[PDB]
Design a protein around this ligand. Structure first.
Ligand code: NA
Ligand code: NA
Lengths: 406, 406
């Protein structure tokens, strides 16, 4: 019995399932979860001292890798001034200025405590601004059969459409022409694994919102600062009414933000009638400020994309050599692995058709090789700027050995 | 124009109303909000360098005062290991053990990212465990006419009762005998200012839940570790089915937790069918662990209560000398000021009958005296263990001078 196994047994007595986050229970992959002592650059170190090349990046915040010195220095300096104040600070203003500089579509912005609060606040704003009740969301897309604990009437004003399918979106609008307040969309799906949009998809959503008087909300909690500096909306050339941000903007600590067109944001109280939640923590905003300053430097996204592209190329080549059907999706610093015979993976149905038991065996074989992947078939992979060409070639060599055993 | 006034003008261009949290806009009191540079012990220091005796305590987290060395040391040490991991840690287990040791009614516990997530998760668990849809909540009580942005059917399964009125609770149960999943109650109301329960009230809620098969959820996000070490539930001798915690458990950074009876908590996934949100951040849990270790030492609550009682006594005496009708409510390290002719303040209607314009003038006069009070008539005051007898006598002397000017 390892230190992780002992901590898991201990945890099970006081925490249901031994974990606070059900995905961290390894339910997706099976077995006992890995407890982590520390992290540095491209690596995770478990409680038994084993090192792993990390492709989880704490679920997307660690763009610069773990424990980046500029972020660590900014937080140690901020901590001397106190953790929180319950009153506004100069960092709130500086952070709002930096975020609106980096993401130009945002004229105004509000910082919140998490990505979930940002999406919920953006949805509430769209409903208040338009005076309409219905929202369009996509299947396999999480923003923050029937599950126990929630009353049936809770999902009454939510219209679920098919990701990358403009016809299903038009159909929902044609059913409710004057009732859709907004479309909320992940510009690159990340919660059904990594699914980039079809070229027609995001401009098609912008044109439908314009036609039917709805607001377009682009949820960049995961894609923000990962796909591109100015977001996946910049990369795919689409201008939304509102943007949601999280993760990277906190530099490793929870932070959220939502922003958009000046006249939409002006509808928020005290300026307007829409009321929203907790403000951004000062330590988390100091971490995020330092992170955003570092990634806005020349050549950062070029390097991130080159690292991710080299991993995707190597994995495809390794799978082919070992006769393992595999699709790799990737954009900027984001990627997704799919064990399927399909030529492309562009929708939720394609993800559902992947070989989940094969992914589970691959995941455990990769842990043995010292590679830590997201422990789910329905989660995207993340590249960091601390990963070296050597880390990538080691990962590709490890995947080839794992593919030979499937 | 001060540095706070300049930051506020700057903030208004990019942030609706110049603040992230509408209460921090000083809407309750009027005027331009104070921007805070730093905090230490019992004091806040604004961006112009002015010192204030603080009674906001960052909205309750700062039980040990601001920037406590044990908390600062624990976070600087934890930050070296990385900010977040997206995987379980030993601190999750240690923190769960410490919280269940301090609050004995909790057999099992789950850590979440905020107090709001804890109350929402506890409400979802009660609904899932009982299979019922309705919840009872109290007016003036916030857990996380009609406001724009939320559809009308959203509050369909919520029954609002009157705080400190057992008859209104019985009436709601008699209307829906087999449909109430739970009662969620702040054991000391803090979001309509400070309203302690009547002696009959919390035991009466326990007896009604038992009669009608509902779960009793005690929301201790604010009262936890403030009223007493084992919570206001220990102080008022009531045993709930579930407890919600926040604030102090994060040592100044956002953290939430919900816990309760072993068989109720076992209904959570993967062990049971109820699914919930983000896990506790490691830096925030290191801050909370150090905070909870410090306040569980002998004599802490005795000192906290003595400080709060001496402030309440001094304020009452000062108001009487100056012919200003005032009610002071207080329990453990929590207090509330009420400008009213009423003999007692025990309900929402009493709070509504207070002189709000008098509170607004008092608040601004106290800021001039170097005392920072919650900038709302509907918010409780907080005592810290860093406040000295001299701080308290200075506050009482300042309040007497302010009462003479009302
Ligand atoms: Na490329
Ligand atoms: Na007393």
């Amino acid at each position: 019995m390892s230190k992780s196994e002992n901590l898991y047994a201990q945890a099970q007595q006081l925490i249901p399932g031994g974990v606070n986050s059900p995905v961290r229970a390894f339910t997706g992959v099976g077995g006992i979860p890995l407890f982590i002592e520390r992290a540095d650059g491209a690596y995770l170190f478990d409680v038994d001292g084993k090192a792993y090349i990390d492709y989880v990046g704490s679920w997307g915040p660690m763009i610069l890798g773990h424990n980046h010195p500029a972020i660590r220095q900014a937080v140690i300096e901020a901590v001397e001034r106190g953790l929180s104040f319950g009153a506004p600070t100069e960092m709130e203003v500086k952070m709002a200025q930096l975020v609106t500089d980096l993401v130009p579509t945002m004229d105004m912005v509000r910082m919140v405590n998490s990505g979930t609060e940002a999406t919920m606040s953006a949805i509430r704003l769209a409903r208040g601004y338009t005076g309409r009740d219905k929202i369009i969301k996509f299947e396999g897309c999480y923003h923050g059969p029937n599950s126990p604990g929630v009353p049936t009437d809770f999902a009454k004003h939510t219209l679920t459409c098919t990701y990358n399918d403009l016809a299903s979106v038009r159909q929902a609008f044609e059913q409710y022409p004057q009732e859709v307040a907004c479309i909320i969309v992940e510009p690159v799906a990340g919660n059904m694994n990594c699914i980039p949009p079809l070229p027609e998809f995001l401009p098609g959503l912008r044109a439908l919102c314009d036609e039917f008087g709805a607001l377009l909300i682009i949820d960049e909690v995961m894609t923000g600062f990962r796909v591109a500096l100015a977001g996946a909306q910049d990369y795919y050339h689409v201008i939304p009414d509102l943007t949601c941000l999280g993760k990277i903007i906190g530099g490793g600590m929870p932070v959220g933000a939502f922003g958009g067109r000046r006249e939409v944001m002006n509808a928020l109280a005290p300026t307007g009638p829409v009321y929203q939640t907790l403000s951004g923590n000062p330590i988390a905003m100091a971490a995020g400020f330092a992170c955003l300053t570092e990634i806005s430097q020349v050549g950062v996204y070029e390097t991130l994309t080159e690292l991710t592209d080299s991993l995707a190329t190597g994995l495809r080549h390794a799978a082919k050599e070992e006769n393992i059907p595999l699709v790799v999706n990737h954009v900027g610093g984001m990627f997704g692995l799919f064990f399927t015979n399909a030529d492309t993976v562009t929708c939720y149905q394609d993800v559902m058709n992947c070989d989940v038991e094969r992914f589970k065996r691959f995941f455990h074989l990769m842990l043995e090789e010292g590679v830590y992947l997201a422990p789910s078939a329905f989660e995207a992979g993340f590249m960091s700027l601390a990963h070296s060409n050597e880390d990538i070639q080691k990962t590709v060599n490890a995947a080839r050995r794992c593919f030979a055993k499937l």
